């Protein structure tokens, strides 16, 4: 047998089960045993197995945990299986895969990509008499919009860019900088005024009447999350490119999730054959239909687009457009990023809700973050 595991909701469980049944029909000698759970319970399951050396042969993995599990050669490098043909990448661009690489080894194979977006309620934009020119609106343009939306529609401008470990790095990209060094040993940006300018704008918005409720004309999220909001909201919603991405190509092709193979598996070829099937089989992807993010193969993408309805189509058309003006994905979050993230959240509300000056909070943050990461 081959063991396979993932997290998600019940719709995902249902079609993933159907994908596995299809695989077994086409591969009778391979039985698959599935385990699955919501996000929280899933890591609860996988964490003890990781160190006990008994993970499933195919592991659904998240970028924020890839570096941790890839410790001490615990994950199998997938790069050679892309080279011997086990995993076909002839229709998968490199730019879909780099969010799963650490030190030039592919510890996770990306199953789908997401792109940050400003998701807007069209009825509430109209009500306030405002609109978004997504191709080149600026951060100043966004702040105006949030103010205008409140005083002319009584609705929040936005949920707010939460959390800060996602949208401060986005801000940095809009200014041509980066949060993590690619090698994960420290923060890349060195100019504390980037930090100051980010959290001063957060101050202005949070202390304003203009500050989830999207079912708030505006919500900040990854593109995949639009499906939930668009199905929930009777108003029409649209994905817009976020402010000031054009100049430095601030958006990236973020792995929604990845498949990995643990080095302890005794079924690596069969595991990799399943991953190849998952990302390249047209029939399987008529069942997945983009729910795990935009498919990485342009052949699979072409194959499912006719079947997608309005909301799913909006996502694919958003990602396809954004993807022509992107920068290189971040590597998986480095070990100790959990501490950095907690430090950033704690520093955020010392700024927003205590009177901690952003200039003081800035150097102080950068200080301790670099000491966390310095351990590599």
From Swiss-Prot:
Induction: Up-regulated by growth on type I rhamnogalacturonan. PANTHER family: ABC TRANSPORTER SUBSTRATE-BINDING PROTEIN YESO-RELATED, ARABINOSE-BINDING PROTEIN-RELATED. This is Putative ABC transporter substrate-binding protein YesO. May play a role in the degradation of type I rhamnogalacturonan derived from plant cell walls. Pfam families: SBP_bac_1. InterPro entries: Bact_solute-bd_prot1, SBP. Belongs to the bacterial solute-binding protein 1 family. It comes from the Bacteria. SUPFAM superfamilies: Periplasmic binding protein-like II.
């Amino acid at each position: 047998t081959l063991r396979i595991a993932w997290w998600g909701g019940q719709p995902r469980h249902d079609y993933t089960t159907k994908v596995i049944e299809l695989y077994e029909k086409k591969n009778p000698h391979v039985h698959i045993e599935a385990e699955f759970a919501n996000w929280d319970d899933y890591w609860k399951k996988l964490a003890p197995m990781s160190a006990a050396g008994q993970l499933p042969d195919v592991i659904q993995m998240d970028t924020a945990y890839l570096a941790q599990y890839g410790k001490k050669n615990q994950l199998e490098d997938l790069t050679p299986y892309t080279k011997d043909g086990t995993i076909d990448v002839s229709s998968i661009d490199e730019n879909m895969l780099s969010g799963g690489k650490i030190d030039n080894k592919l510890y996770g194979f990306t199953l789908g990509v997401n792109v940050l977006s400003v998701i807007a309620n069209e009825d509430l934009l109209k009500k306030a008499g405002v609109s978004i020119n997504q191709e080149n609106w600026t951060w100043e343009d966004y702040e105006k919009l949030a103010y205008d939306l409140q005083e002319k529609a009584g609705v929040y401008g936005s949920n707010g860019m939460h959390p800060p470990d996602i949208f401060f790095p986005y801000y940095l990209r809009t200014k041509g900088e980066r949060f993590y060094k690619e090698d994960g040993t420290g923060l890349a940006y060195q100019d504390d005024q980037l930090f100051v300018d980010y959290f001063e704008r957060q101050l202005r918005l949070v202390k304003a009447k203009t500050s989830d409720f999207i079912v708030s004309a505006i919500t900040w999220n990854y593109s995949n999350q639009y499906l939930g909001f668009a199905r929930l909201t009777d108003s029409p919603l649209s994905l817009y490119l976020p402010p000031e991405q054009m100049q430095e190509k601030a958006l990236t092709l973020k792995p929604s999730m990845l498949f990995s193979i643990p080095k302890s598996s005794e079924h690596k070829k069969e595991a990799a054959k399943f991953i190849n099937f998952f990302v390249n089989n047209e029939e399987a992807n008529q069942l997945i239909k983009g729910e795990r993010g935009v498919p990485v193969s342009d052949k699979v993408a072409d194959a499912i687009k006719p079947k997608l309805n309005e909301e799913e189509t909006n996502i694919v058309e958003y990602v396809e457009t954004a993807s022509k003006n992107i920068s290189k994905a971040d590597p998986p979050e480095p070990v100790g990023s959990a501490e950095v993230i907690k430090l950033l959240k704690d520093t955020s509300d010392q700024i927003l809700y205590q009177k901690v000056s952003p200039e003081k909070a800035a150097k102080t943050f950068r200080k301790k973050a670099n000491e966390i990461l310095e351990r590599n």
